[PDB]
Amino acid sequence: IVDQVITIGKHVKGYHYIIANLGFTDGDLLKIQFGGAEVSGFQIVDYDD
Amino acid sequence: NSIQIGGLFPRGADQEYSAFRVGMVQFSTSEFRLTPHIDNLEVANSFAVTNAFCSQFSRGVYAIFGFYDKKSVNTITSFCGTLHVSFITPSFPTDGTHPFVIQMRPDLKGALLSLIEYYQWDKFAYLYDSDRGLSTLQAVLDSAAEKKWQVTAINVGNINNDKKDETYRSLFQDLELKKERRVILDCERDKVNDIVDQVITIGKHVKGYHYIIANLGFTDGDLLKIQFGGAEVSGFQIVDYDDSLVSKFIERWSTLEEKEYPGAHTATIKYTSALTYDAVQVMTEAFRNLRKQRIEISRRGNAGDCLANPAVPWGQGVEIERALKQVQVEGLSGNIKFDQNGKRINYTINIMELKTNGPRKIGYWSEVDKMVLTEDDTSGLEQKTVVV
Amino acid sequence: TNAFCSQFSRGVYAIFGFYDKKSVNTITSFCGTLHVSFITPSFPTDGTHPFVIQMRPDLKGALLSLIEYYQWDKFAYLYDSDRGLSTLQAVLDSAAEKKWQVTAINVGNINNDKKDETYRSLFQDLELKKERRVILDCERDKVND
Numbered sequence: 374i375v376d377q378v379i380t381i382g383k384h385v386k387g388y389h390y391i392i393a394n395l396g397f398t399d400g401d402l403l404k405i406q407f408g409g410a411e412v413s414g415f416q417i418v419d420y421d422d
Numbered sequence: 423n424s425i426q427i428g429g430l431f432p433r434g435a436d437q438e439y440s441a442f443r444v445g446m447v448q449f450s451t452s453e454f455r456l457t458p459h460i461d462n463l464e465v466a467n468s469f470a471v472t473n474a475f476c477s478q479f480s481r482g483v484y485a486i487f488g489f490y491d492k493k494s495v496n497t498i499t500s501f502c503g504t505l506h507v508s509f510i511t512p513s514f515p516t517d518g519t520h521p522f523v524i525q526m527r528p529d530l531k532g533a534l535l536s537l538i539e540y541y542q543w544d545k546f547a548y549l550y551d552s553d554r555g556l557s558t559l560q561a562v563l564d565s566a567a568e569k570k571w572q573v574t575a576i577n578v579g580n581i582n583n584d585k586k587d588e589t590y591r592s593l594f595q596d597l598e599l600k601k602e603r604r605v606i607l608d609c610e611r612d613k614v615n616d617i618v619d620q621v622i623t624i625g626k627h628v629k630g631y632h633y634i635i636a637n638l639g640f641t642d643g644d645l646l647k648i649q650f651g652g653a654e655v656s657g658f659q660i661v662d663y664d665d666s667l668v669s670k671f672i673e674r675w676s677t678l679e680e681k682e683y684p685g686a687h688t689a690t691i692k693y694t695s696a697l698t699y700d701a702v703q704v705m706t707e708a709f710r711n712l713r714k715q716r717i718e719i720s721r722r723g724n725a726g727d728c729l730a731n732p733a734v735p736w737g738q739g740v741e742i743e744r745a746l747k748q749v750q751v752e753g754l755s756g757n758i759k760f761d762q763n764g765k766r767i768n769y770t771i772n773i774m775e776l777k778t779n780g781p782r783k784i785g786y787w788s789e790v791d792k793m794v795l796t797e798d799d800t801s802g803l804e805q806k807t808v809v810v
Numbered sequence: 811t812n813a814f815c816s817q818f819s820r821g822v823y824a825i826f827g828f829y830d831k832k833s834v835n836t837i838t839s840f841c842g843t844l845h846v847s848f849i850t851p852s853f854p855t856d857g858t859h860p861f862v863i864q865m866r867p868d869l870k871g872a873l874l875s876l877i878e879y880y881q882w883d884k885f886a887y888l889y890d891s892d893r894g895l896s897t898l899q900a901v902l903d904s905a906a907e908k909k910w911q912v913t914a915i916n917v918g919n920i921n922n923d924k925k926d927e928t929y930r931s932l933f934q935d936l937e938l939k940k941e942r943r944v945i946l947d948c949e950r951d952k953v954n955d
């Protein structure tokens with residue numbers, strides 16, 4: 374879905390995407406890291422522990 | 423019969439050498455066969471270029487077909503001009519007048535200029551490459567005073583692959599100071615793909631932006647990634663796949679085995695490879711005209727070292743050059759004919775506009791006619807005009 | 811190339827000479843492989859090149875710092891093609907970092923017969939923007955003209 378959002382260019386400033394799963398940091402986020410859209414998610418495996 | 427010809431290729435040339443072999447097979451008549459001596463070496467190092475040129479000269483070649491980079495242009499031109507050796511190259515044409523060189527690639531500066539005239543651009547960005555030659559950059563800089571444009575030229579060529587992601591993002595953040603939406607990329611397809619990837623990463627490929635690819639390899643690079651972004655992409659293509667000749671050539675090209683001929687099974691061919699094929703054709707027709715006019719070419723052996731205190735250039739090479747420049751044939755690049763200097767005259771460069779369906783032939787340009795073909799939609803798709 | 815290989819066959823230890831826009835690539839690639847020392851007072855090569863000693867210092871930063879000192883925002887740049895486009899590329903790249911409107915004209919490729927006409931037409935074309943600040947990147951012999 375993120376790849377498709379990138380292809381259509383709907384990941385720029387203004388858009389807001391919330392990932393509704395406990396796998397936020399396991400998947401690569403660098404492709405939308407610089408798009409502009411504010412992405413938010415959830416993580417159960419805190420690597421800082 | 424067996425005409426020894428030189429074949430200097432870069433080590434990274436694969437589809438170009440494949441098209442050279444396909445052209446060698448297609449035009450190997452029983453009247454005479456062209457035997458090529460292939461030398462794969464580093465195109466950048468001018469010392470190795472000089473060594474290979476003097477090796478071919480010591481072997482006794484009649485016409486050298488090769489490529490060159492910004493370092494080797496002067497050595498090749500100054501060696502072929504003095505030693506009277508014929509040279510054929512699909513690379514970028516030399517700036518000015520240079521003899522004994524047949525540049526298969528046509529002149530694209532007027533094409534980009536006429537396209538800017540058609541789009542009516544007054545302020546845009548120009549990301550240029552240093553290795554591709556500053557000829558087009560000088561032409562647009564000189565036109566920036568005749569027609570008064572505010573162009574922002576950036577040398578993106580000198581970037582390191584380690585700091586690649588950082589330099590490109592900083593470049594586009596610096597280009598957002600003027601809020602630039604119109605960008606022209608004067609780079610090779612291999613680098614244009616990276617620039618497009620970075621534009622996709624930063625999200626500057628949405629509606630509003632306009633990107634012009636300033637090279638004859640528009641369809642060679644993958645355009646489907648920016649096909650649906652929203653930004654109107656436009657470029658230039660010399661190898662028109664809609665041609666019946668090009669279609670019949672691609673029919674055999676795709677069916678060829680990928681193991682023996684590298685990069686041949688594809689349906690799209692790079693413009694450099696097609697220009698290599700057409701150069702082989704032009705060489706064959708040149709030697710055929712030399713046989714038709716009963717002009718005997720012969721070396722008997724070798725005159726000696728290219729380096730000499732008495733400069734000894736063999737005369738018959740002039741006739742070979744004249745026969746090369748006189749040939750007017752039809753090939754993958756369209757109409758192929760050369761003038762007294764060796765540049766391409768009377769050519770057909772198609773202007774493509776990437777829509778949602780894909781690459782669309784929006785027009786074509788020539789040396790005499792600027793922006794002719796107004797085919798398909800003539801501004802009549804989704805307009806919605808309410809009659810009051 | 812002929813003179814360089816003649817000196818190499820003679821047995822020189824270090825060659826002191828000059829080069830033009832055409833021959834530079836031949837010299838650098840010949841001294842680099844044959845490990846022969848070269849010294850030249852001409853313009854420095856763009857980038858890093860070994861076995862070459864350029865006596866001339868780098869002037870790009872001097873012109874850039876002088877433009878910063880004079881506080882110029884819109885000017886003309888009449889450059890020479892034979893003298894190398896290094897300074898022109900440096901000022902074009904700085905024209906986005908510091909945002910300048912530079913009008914670069916290639917005055918280098920002009921004929922001595924049509925000299926007065928090409929120059930008068932160039933300055934008449936530069937009066938469209940009413941440019942008063944001009945930078946001349948040419949050799950002294952041409953700067954006098």
Ligand SMILES: *[C@@H]1O[C@H](CO)[C@@H](O[C@@H]2O[C@H](CO)[C@@H](O[C@@H]3O[C@H](CO)[C@@H](O)[C@H](O[C@@H]4O[C@H](CO)[C@@H](O)[C@H](O)[C@@H]4O)[C@@H]3O)[C@H](O)[C@H]2NC(C)=O)[C@H](O)[C@H]1NC(C)=O
Binds near residue numbers: 759767790
């Ligand atoms: C289809 O193709 C035809 C042949 O290729 C072409 O006819 C050519 O037309 C052009 C312009 O009309 C002619 O160009 C001139 O060439 C002569 C020398 O041959 C010169 O008068 C001049 O160039 C000179 O040579 C140098 C060029 O760099 C330069 O140093 C000189 O100062 C001077 O400029 C013109 O450029 C050309 O000769 C014609 N060819 C022939 C064989 O007669 C058709 O126009 C073309 N048609 C279409 C529709 O494309």
